[model samples]
Target: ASTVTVDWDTTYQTIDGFGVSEAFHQSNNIARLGETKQNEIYDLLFSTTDGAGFSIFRSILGDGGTWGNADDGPNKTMQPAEDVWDWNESNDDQIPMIRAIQSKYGVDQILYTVWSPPAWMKTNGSVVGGSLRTDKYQAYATYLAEHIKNYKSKFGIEITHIGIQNEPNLETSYSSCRWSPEELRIFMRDYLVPTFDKENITAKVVFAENMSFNEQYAINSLNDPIAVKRVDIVGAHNYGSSYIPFTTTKSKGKGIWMTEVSDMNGNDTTINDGLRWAKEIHDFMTITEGNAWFYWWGACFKTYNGEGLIQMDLNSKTYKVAKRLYTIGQFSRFIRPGWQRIEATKNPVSNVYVTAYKDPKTGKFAIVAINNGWSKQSITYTLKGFSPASVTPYTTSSTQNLEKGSDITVNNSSFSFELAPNSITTFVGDTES
Candidate 1:
């Protein structure tokens, strides 16, 4: 039998939270569904007892008009003109959904991101493809400040993080805006940050939401003393297959967030796919030391595609939860915000990866073990520092949806159990009684 040791004395990064986005009119898809269906979907996503317990809600700072691929609906712009504000446009559904989640489950952290600046502020005069006009940098900053202010004054939902741009390097047929690393650094230092200070907008500033993890823009900004002080989070995506951490950003005491990534290929809602996602989360936690991870869309009207965790058939008024959902919950449900990642043997056995966390405030702990092999493996766990009387194991496997297993006895700081093949299990210490 292989042994994995968890050292509670040694710790790594503090986890911010796990989340999903409802961008590009995807929120409209869920809002249009019947109330019963919408509530069911909400429970699966935000219910701490019965759902994924996602703590963050990432919504698009909408740019008007349909400028994306087929079936992409127009996402309304709050500020269409230089002075116009339409709080009731695309947000008719988003606001209600956000309010409901807050009142019902108290899901925290509202992250707002602009896919592109308004058409008038862009060099190309459209939201589809362009860069922010050099002349409009100050205007764009003011617009963001006003938006954040209105979000609070209008709906009582405070924006926690404000992303300046999403995927600044790519300009495609879809909604996008291109910006060089130097340009982003300059904008943040001279315009956005200054405007936030002047207006007293307290939302944390996130910059250069790159589509990949290369960290070119993040490094560029972090290297500059003025810009570095202004940046609150270094954000990137995992689409390019490079899984690495932002060393400089982390060392500067800033957060690293995998803001958005999803498997866009045809939807394969199976345990096999769930295993793949488990490995992705594992890599983010161990390799990148990411504070937060976000999937692309929480729920969407797409079918037979991997766009959303909860896929919806709008016409049929039906939805299906993918195994990927539960796999993510295996981490998001227990390892909440403010929990510190404690030291754990990553590969105590072949084909099995382990990562652990501890609640700094409560002294409770959670250990996650992923078995990628094809057969069950019996393994031993050795605990350090704090020891619990018993641990509750929740397993998500080929046939399990976060099914709670019988309590495992922790005798003399150690316990042995057989990990099911092709599964992920989260062991929550029952120490807080």
Candidate 2:
């Protein structure tokens, strides 16, 4: 077989970060653990050497109703009475969790989003299912902006990206809000963006967190001159959705983010699940050209399902790290923010997917290869326009968890290796001292 060649000069999207949300009262699970155990969990999530080193944190704004379970209540900051506020009515668990991540890793890429506005501002007068009242547009914008300002003042944490809603395409029994593409365009251009500007809120304005990227909820905003200028990122979820490029968003020079995705299949904490997630990430980057990717929930307690990266037993006060976490680390650990995806032979062989990335400032390289086939495959990787002293392979499979192996020799700007069956590997090469 021919060696897969990676082009250094050619590059694609600039990755903002890989992330997972500790939303919907998931942080409360972490908060309940013992101090020592909590630190361990944090390290497992944000530690560079010991964890995934994920840079982005997705936080769900509260809507004043219980979510996930009764143990998790709403962080309803505002009520029906205008200007009447209660800062204490919020998700206290998440604040400490966010602080811990910042203090430890300085993880600043926080994407703040809300599932729905308060019931008083909605047409249905309930957060379960409703659309924002058309007359409440300016008031809704003020509510979002004020929350951002107060969050910073109270928690000392700055939000980097702000979105008005999550899954605007679906109206679910859970906290959800519906919006038309035109409704979103008008609200963003006339209210949300302007309110942020007036408040001097520097966070990037992300629009229409649709239930699926296939929905193209961002179309109206991307096409409208005024709205397109106000929006910074086009965000969506991937549920029963194919990974494809957002050509219009890119044409308008807006960031494309696959904000939330996960398996609803009962929890399978094995390499099978890990490989499945690896393939998902590969497709998101290779096909969708997503600037950012996020899993639905960072941690889930009692209920063991694929929605979470880590599983916690609140009753036993214990936790288990799923193989899926390590597999995600294959990319999140080495690929820091600002690294660009470069051109590479995406599929040198059947059932194998490969994507290459480079650090512009440091000249470091990371090549992630996923072998989805049932049998082992041998392959060669050739580097163009860049060279390194050596490359190291980190493997995650049924028997291994990001286990580091001996360095591979690079001769004539190429190296050969055999990929394990049903595994994901990241080859890291450092050219600088």
Candidate 3:
């Protein structure tokens, strides 16, 4: 195995934020309106884990649509019919779940985004398809703002941010909405932002939560002066497209966020595959200049389409963490919420993937390396600007979980280690000075 060198002195980017989606809390919509299971969902999000502590919770605001209804169509993974939408009442079934998370994890950390508008608000009068009619644009914006206001008043949970739409270009059997770039621009500028100002709402607006290929949608939306002025965040979904294009466009003032992505059973969950996802995340923060990375469907246990980091049992209330969960922890655990991404490089010869971070409070330096090669490889890391008294390493691989102190040492600028085939390792060192 060939050894690789890492230069820590050079720093590139800062991590803006990290979060997990709330779709799994409802769990295929099984925990319906007014049910005790809803509270269980809250407990799951609040629970701590060994890998990484998640700070942000992405809540899915659902439309009044049935999961098992025939109209929902084939190929749709419908939740139980018991889960229904109730917009009129303050104590709707979903509120308790939201409140529980807020009480457990501060209210400011809870960010909310809707996948689809209420059925009545759409042209098709259904959650699955159709775009917002032009005439109802203002009403739609008002309706969204009110939901945020109501949540604040009733649950005392303030919604800090909102995405205009989730995967606006794709029409699916599941919950979704479609919007063109121009349509989104108008909605954000003429409706959403103005309504927030009128209602005295401070929640930030995000745009273009689309699959990978539709990044152009983001560029187009931001190109509009009115839309550009209203948007505080630009959201992207890693479903079908590559992260390079999005990363390349990161400097447009809006903080970039990966709002939704799934680890499909096949290629999406492997360590190498997860590394690719992480690389996108690393590049987004470093290259494109994004601030946060959020994952989709955090808790499905049976299959990988949209399962979360932790899988739960509906009948037994048991849960197990997935490999991808730990893969996420590799970044989330070490990279604190306020920490920034710094510059680091892996030797090109070693084929090792590397990302570096600096904790602002402690000034500690952390380096994450992913070995995607087929054979074992030894790598040396050197911190350019920062020096540490000692170094400790934590590793996650196919055979071994995240066991800390696998290796530790001090007094050398360069260090080398053998990374198992298709594994991830993180090194943390104290930068006291």
Candidate 4:
């Protein structure tokens, strides 16, 4: 096994995309603790062929003065009371599961955020933890821009992006809010970006979901020049961080999102710590140029937040799909959406975790390899300019649970294989028509 020198037009890193969350679409708090089946949680979160073609869906508004008999336990509980939070009208128990996942995945790809805010506008009124009560910060920014303008005028659907607090310095027992980075830059510049520009609401204002070791509260809330001129996106949370200081302040943001994470349970399930959490998400999209990365509670009880990449047993509805979902289909099925993260180098004593990409419309060159050691690694993948004819090995370990497809042949430049004992290997080469 020996061949290493792949240039493929020397590019290295780009795929600011990948998503999963409808608050897991159903079971908004262990609906009857475990045996999942609420009509298969909307066919396992809007199944785009279930190979995960997710583009972004967080949606969870709930908290408008609380309902559903406040039971906060047995997993969490609270959603379905017309989906909580009705600051003046429009019943929203997650707007019919975000208009049935935006009429089955269409409403401009969807994105909405709100973990808490509506226990009578906080300050120990209680959603849990409590903060936000500087005289109810302009009616909590007109109750979050009137729940994004009554979920876009009664479900015409359009949220795009929003995250005032999901983990703002957590003080939780679940559903939380504690803020501080000058109270989230005075609730996003004196009340959520001027109440989403006086309700013209374009959305896109994200900041500090925090907890990626709080990179000193994400560099004091994106270097607070008034929350870096009203944030446009810089949300993070790996839960008890450590990915080289969250890629050193996610390279001083301008667009970074790993909005969440989850491992579920233990016993290492041969995921080898999910290839070291997909090699710390391919070294935070190769040194913080991240666009989107979300994962935390998709399906539960095969483990805790059961970090779903489709597990769903719920007592035999029949579904497995894990191995960190083919180590995230080796970067979400070959890094699709506007791909660009390019540049690579490995063997700095090799525990072997590498990432590479460049598919500016079929100029395909994708390399994602992660072997979380237990012995067995042979690397030399050096592709610099463009050369194609053979090199396609899509593999995920424990007896090929990544489904199956294997082809290998590349000579004179670089190609060698022997990465077993906790695997994840993807090397597709064919650059230019």
Better-scoring candidate (TM-score), 1 or 3: 1
Residue lDDT tens for model 1, 138-189: 9899989988898888768789899999999899887789999989888888
On residues 148-250, what C-alpha lDDT tens digit does candidate 4 reach at each position? 6665675566777877777777776656778777767666766766677767777776676776634555566566555565576767777766644344344
The sequence of per-residue lDDT tens digits that candidate 2 reaches over residues 61-160 is: 7677655564554565454445567677344457878888998888988788888888878899888888999999998899888878877897677888
Give the better candidate number (2 or 4) by TM-score: 2
Off by over 4 Å in 2: 66-68, 78-80, 89-91
Candidate number that wins on lDDT, 2 or 4: 2
Shift of residue 200 alpha carbon in model 1, Å? 1.4
Residue pairs whose backbone atoms clash in candidate 1: none
Question: Looking at candidate 4, what is the lDDT of residue 278?
Answer: 80
The C-alpha lDDT values of all candidates are: 0.85, 0.84, 0.64, 0.61
Which of the two candidates, 2 or 3, achieves a greater TM-score against the reference? 2
Model 4: worst 10 consecutive residues (lDDT sum): 71-80
For candidate 4, the per-residue lDDT at 108 reads: 49
State the displacement of the C-alpha of residue 287, model 2, in Å, after optimal TM-score superposition.
Answer: 1.4
Order of the predicted models by TM-score, top scorer first? 1, 2, 3, 4
Q: C-alpha displacement of 399 in model 1, angstroms?
A: 0.6
Model 4: lDDT of residue 328: 67
